[PDB]
């Protein structure tokens, strides 16, 4: 039958009966108000339905209308700048149609507007009788000045073209394409529907090999992400989100508030339309190339899960267009707590700290959807999705099961540390706990464009590790054992920690730092370490020693210049000027050392 009846309820879990033919993960409407729910068990003609909306008021014997599709998203024009509920309902259009501050329980606003006119240009290669396959780009929609929305044939669809719309304005209901296979005609509009838990397939999961500049010098030097880079960060988030949203190389951005604090959700939603970037020699709002999935912590447990799978599925859509999507998620821990609550209500056996054992498999089915891809279909193009999933632990402890499962999966991990955050060191990344498995691949790009950088990256982490050794012993011995080279190591480690790794996320001089500035800063600080270390060691067993203090006194101007490198404005001082100034610092540095040699 087309509808069953509610047999029982327990919070956001509803048992139905007379559901005989229903599939697991099939969508359902429950109650006379049509609350959205999804099947999560079957037992004879009974089914258990997870509900995405508050179930208070649902009665035994209420209708249980099943829909023969799993949890799915509308993909098509009108995603850029939109904001969505975790089951894909537009929070802008719910406001606009409801005329009230509340989301109506059971509201059914179409995920992409049926009313807004779109400029569609059919792809000029096509003709009636042309063969097409999933991921073919049969038209461009001018959704924005920034993002050309490539309309794509759905995956699991293929055939011969029987109708193509001429260039013009069309609605999301207009059948802009018709195709045929096996004598079956199929009709397609500018929108496609895709299951959120099913991966969008690809021609080839290519290796990730080009950096993705976060703008934080510590990250982009010592722990870099890559296009397609599967990444995590301890939630502490806003600056990384905003910096990537303004300046990431990624044409498209997605945010996923999975269980976000209602006020921090409003901060993001209010600030993002007002944030702008200078691109193509013009200034534009990041919202013209972003979308957000928003679920405040009080949204029902299932909406917290659906927010992740919708967010990644949107990312995989813009990936298939050939855009290098970057996605952020507010907290994988809140998602895991949603899985914990679902698991508990469903009477499953949890395994550690009350989490389900399948938590690792859930997280993997998110994080492994990242990466560079060769897209499906005929125009050969490469897209990517980068995932920056945040992971706040109960006391900052990285042994917490969400962090442990994440750490077995992610290739990059930016371990933020309470001691740094407390002393207001920003961006608070611990440079001895964090790692990036992408270095192996990225060293090809670095050796093509930045040949000095790999030596500098290695010497930097070495200097910073020798800082921990020297800093620990000073607690007991004070200065008395330290060699003059150990002093030079501590001085340069202080420069690298306080004037390179440190960066103010709110001040325009440090809001974002380009790579040419980043490598030039580090080049100068480590060239100082090498020249100072030489100046000391050249006098080993000699009649007179060039000490750390003799260096520090003669080099005082150069030391002040070195610390000052961070102040160069990337807007008014272009890369040519910054590189030229830093080349003068290198010459000044060499000549200042030459006075002692």
């Amino acid at each position: 039958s087309t509808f069953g009846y509610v047999h029982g309820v327990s919070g956001p879990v509803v048992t139905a009966c007379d559901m005989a033919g229903a599939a697991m993960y099939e969508l359902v409407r429950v109650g006379h108000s049509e609350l959205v729910g999804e099947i999560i068990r079957l037992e004879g003609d009974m089914a258990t339905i997870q509900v995405y909306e508050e179930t208070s008021g649902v009665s035994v014997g209420d209708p249980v209308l099943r829909t023969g599709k799993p949890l799915s998203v509308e993909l098509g024009p009108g995603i850029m700048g939109a904001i969505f509920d975790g089951i894909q309902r537009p929070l802008s259009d719910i406001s606009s149609q409801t005329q009230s501050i509340y989301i109506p329980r059971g509201v059914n606003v179409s995920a992409l507007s049926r009313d807004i006119k779109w400029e569609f240009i059919p792809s000029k290669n096509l003709r009636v009788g042309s063969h097409i396959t999933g991921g073919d780009i049969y038209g461009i929609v001018n959704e924005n000045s920034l993002i050309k929305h490539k309309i794509m044939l759905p995956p699991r669809s293929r055939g011969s073209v029987t109708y193509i719309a001429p260039p013009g304005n069309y609605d999301a209901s207009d059948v802009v394409l018709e195709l045929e296979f096996e004598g079956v005609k199929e009709k397609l509009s500018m929108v496609q529907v895709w299951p959120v838990r099913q991966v969008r397939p690809v021609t080839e999961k290519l290796p990730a090999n080009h950096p993705l500049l976060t703008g934080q010098r510590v990250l982009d030097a010592l722990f870099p992400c890559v296009q397609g880079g599967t990444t995590a960060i301890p939630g502490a988030k806003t600056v990384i989100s905003q910096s990537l949203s303004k300046y990431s190389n990624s044409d498209v951005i997605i945010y996923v508030g999975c269980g976000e604090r209602g006020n921090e959700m409003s901060e993001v939603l209010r600030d993002f339309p007002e944030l702008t970037m200078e691109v193509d020699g013009k200034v534009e709002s990041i919202m013209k190339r972003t979308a957000l999935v928003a679920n405040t912590s009080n949204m029902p447990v299932a909406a917290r899960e659906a927010s992740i799978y919708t967010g990644i599925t949107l990312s995989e859509y813009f990936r298939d267009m050939g855009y290098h999507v970057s996605m952020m998620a507010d907290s994988t821990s809140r998602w895991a707590e949603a899985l914990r609550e679902i698991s508990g209500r469903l009477a499953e056996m949890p395994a550690d700290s009350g989490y389900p054992a399948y938590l690792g498999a859930r997280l993997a089915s998110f994080y492994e959807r990242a990466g560079r891809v060769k897209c499906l279909g005929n125009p050969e193009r490469e897209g990517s999705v980068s995932i920056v999933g945040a992971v706040s632990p109960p006391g900052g402890d990285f042994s917490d099961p969400v962090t442990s499962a994440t750490l077995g999966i992610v290739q990059v991990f930016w371990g933020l540390d309470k001691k740094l955050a407390q002393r207001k060191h920003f961006p608070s990344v611990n440079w001895l706990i964090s790692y990036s498995k992408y270095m192996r691949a990225l060293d090809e790009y670095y050796d093509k464009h930045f040949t000095e950088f790999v030596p500098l990256r290695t010497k930097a982490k070495e200097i910073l590790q020798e800082e921990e050794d020297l800093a620990e012993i000073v607690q007991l011995v004070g200065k008395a054992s330290l060699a003059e080279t150990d002093k030079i190591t501590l001085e340069v480690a202080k420069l690298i920690k306080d004037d390179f790794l440190q960066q103010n996320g709110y001040t325009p001089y440090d809001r974002f730092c380009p790579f040419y500035k980043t490598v030039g800063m580090l080049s100068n600080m480590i060239s100082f370490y090498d020249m100072a270390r030489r100046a000391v060691e050249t006098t080993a067993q000699s009649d007179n020693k060039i000490t750390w203090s003799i260096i520090r006194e003669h080099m005082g101007e150069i030391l002040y210049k070195l610390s000052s490198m961070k102040f160069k404005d990337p807007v008014k001082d272009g890369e040519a000027k910054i590189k030229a100034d830093y080349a003068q610092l290198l010459e000044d540095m060499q000549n200042a050392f030459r006075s002692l040699e």
Binding site: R261, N263, S297, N298, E341, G354, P394
Partner: protein
């Protein structure tokens, strides 16, 4: 209007602790309310937590003692726990169930509201911005509170968190350059001393005409306290979003609330989350804490300051843990300050406020405020580290700078943190003492403050 006549059932198949289980029930609703006439002739209310065909599981609000499996008559309303609400609930005192406990009559409704509220669309939220001077230097300076924020006062067990919340209720107002919060106070499971303390404070301060008190005490039935914070928030939604009031909600102990979630969930035979609390406690607490903040087209707003006593003082305990993930940080009231007689015992280091970065700024407050708070906070953190070394390696081993951070901590807990319960320092007045503390160090030590701000404010 629900003109259809109510059904009444004697079909009580069992009574497991706080739960009464009925059978043969015609079309029960999840979260429906029922009224049990007991054999002694008394009424008790309850809410249906589970339904399965003809079975319904009723949680009983006024407790189950005296219920009988044959004689008890259970009346079903056909509806969820829609409470009456009106502006007349100000200047009154209610029990935990929402019935009046002062001399006055039942609430004459301006409307009936679902105590679960309704999800406020994130698009229509207005971000909280205007800083409220609590009057307490730790909460106004090292942390901050904004109108529409939800910042809880966490505490160690037995510490003066009630006095801190009463001081906030006396002193809270906007920064100077109709301004009065209607306070809604929700006591869950409090002792009589705490109840009398707040009830008398609201009367003694003369503000009683503009506050609403829900009292559930430690001698009242456990289950009522599940409803008490929701009633308070429903009143706060009405007053703030329908009647434009600026509202401040105080919830007196979310741990005593969470203990009622545990009692009912154990009786339901449910899968336990960690420490025996319900796995859904994150969602449940979110339906309490997320009712805060400004909204589109309203002038009104709801601030919250929940209170939360940590069991065994454990910062990782599920109640404070799940709370810190939901609330806009926390203010932490610490044994180590209280044993040293420092009132209020607010430890600045573990306290955090998510709004600090945006509530504080030029023209919103004194421009130096954000930088001064950042430097003082880091100085206190370094102060605690050298204070550990002072014992572990002996005081004589400390450097001149370490001894300055130790002197800084000794002066800071005295002059900055200690207030006294009726001192009401302005935010500007707080910042003066802030600089007098920073002046302990040489200018070059103040690494988190810009040189322009130091040259304008350090030589004072």
């Amino acid at each position: 209007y629900l003109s259809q006549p109510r059904l009444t059932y004697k079909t009580v198949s069992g009574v497991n602790g706080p739960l009464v289980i009925l059978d043969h029930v015609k079309f029960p609703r999840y979260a429906e309310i029922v009224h049990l006439t007991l054999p002694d002739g008394t009424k008790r209310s309850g809410q249906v937590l589970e339904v399965s065909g003809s079975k319904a599981v009723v949680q009983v609000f006024e407790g189950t003692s005296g219920i009988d499996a044959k004689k008890t008559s259970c009346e079903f309303t056909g509806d969820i726990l829609r409470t009456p609400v009106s502006e007349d609930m100000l200047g009154r005192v209610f029990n935990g169930s929402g019935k009046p406990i002062d001399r006055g009559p039942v609430v004459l409704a301006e409307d009936f509201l679902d105590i679960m509220g309704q999800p406020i669309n994130p698009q229509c939220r207005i971000y909280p911005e205007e800083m409220i001077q609590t009057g307490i230097s730790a909460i106004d300076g090292m942390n901050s509170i904004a109108r529409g924020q939800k910042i809880p006062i966490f505490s160690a067990a037995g510490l003066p968190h009630n006095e801190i919340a009463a001081q906030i209720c006396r002193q809270a107002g906007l920064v100077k350059k109709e301004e009065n919060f209607a306070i809604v106070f929700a006591a869950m499971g409090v002792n009589m001393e705490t109840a009398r303390f707040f009830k008398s404070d609201f009367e003694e301060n003369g503000s009683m005409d503009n506050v609403c008190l829900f009292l559930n005490l430690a001698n009242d039935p456990t289950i009522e306290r599940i409803i008490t914070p929701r009633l308070a928030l429903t009143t706060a939604e009405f007053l703030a979003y329908q009647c434009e009031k600026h509202v401040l909600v105080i919830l007196t102990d979310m741990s005593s609330y969470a203990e009622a979630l545990r009692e009912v969930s154990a009786a339901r035979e449910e899968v336990p989350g960690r420490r025996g609390f319900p796995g859904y406690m994150y969602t449940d607490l979110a339906t309490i804490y997320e009712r805060a903040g400004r909204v589109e087209g309203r002038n009104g707003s709801i601030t919250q300051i929940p209170i939360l006593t940590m069991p065994n003082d454990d910062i990782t305990h599920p109640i404070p843990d799940l709370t810190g993930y939901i609330t806009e940080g926390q203010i932490y009231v610490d044994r180590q300050l209280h044993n040293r007689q420092i009132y209020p015992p607010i430890n600045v280091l573990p306290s955090l406020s998510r709004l600090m970065k945006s509530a504080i700024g030029e023209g919103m407050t004194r421009k130096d405020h954000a930088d001064v708070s950042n430097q003082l906070y880091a100085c206190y953190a370094i102060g605690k580290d050298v204070q550990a070394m002072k014992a572990v390696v002996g005081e004589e081993a400390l450097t001149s700078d370490d001894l300055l951070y130790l002197e800084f901590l000794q002066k800071f807990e005295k002059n900055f943190i200690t207030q006294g319960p009726y001192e009401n320092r302005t935010v500007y007045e707080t910042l003066d003492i802030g600089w007098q503390l920073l002046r302990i160090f040489p200018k070059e030590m103040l690494k988190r403050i810009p040189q322009s701000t130091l040259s304008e404010f350090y030589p004072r």
